[PDB]
């Protein structure tokens, strides 16, 4: 009926929950190390949701889980989801720069995937109150 439910270490908003992770990661790999936790690199869907993630973003660079996919010709959500809602700085997006990075304002860059960030923030579906 209510789901809320997150694992130790993650933070619930809705019905997800969110993993600000810490340490030197490229684009792949963060995308790696969420898959490795049972999570994925975030999507990112509404202005709520946004909002929520600048409140704990890191204020140097976070990945998060967009990039350009050159067979689809398009940004691509880790998950298959496309790009609804966005929130890229003025002028962003601006070849090579196929990675999509969020800035302490939350706003979104592209970027060369093997740069090198000290954030990235992962997430998956909140678990829910059980029968009594």
């Known amino acids: ?3 809320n439910t997150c694992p130790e270490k993650w933070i619930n908003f809705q019905r997800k929950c969110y993993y600000f992770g810490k340490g030197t990661k490229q684009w792949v790999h963060a995308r790696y ?4 936790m049972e999570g994925q690199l975030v999507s990112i869907h509404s202005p709520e949701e946004q909002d929520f993630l600048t409140k704990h973003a890191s204020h140097t660079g976070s990945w998060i889980g967009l990039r350009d996919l050159d067979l689809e010709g398009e940004f691509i959500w880790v998950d298959g989801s496309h ?3 966005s929130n890229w700085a003025p002028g962003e997006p601006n070849q090579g720069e196929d990675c999509v990075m969020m800035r302490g304002s939350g706003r979104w860059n592209d970027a060369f995937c093997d740069r090198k960030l000290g954030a990235w923030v992962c997430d998956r579906l909140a678990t829910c109150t059980p029968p009594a």
Do not use: K, N, Q
Not at 33 to 36: G, H, Q, T
């Open 1 to 3: 009926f209510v789901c």
């Open 33 to 36: 190390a969420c898959d490795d």
């Open 83 to 85: 790009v609804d809602y």
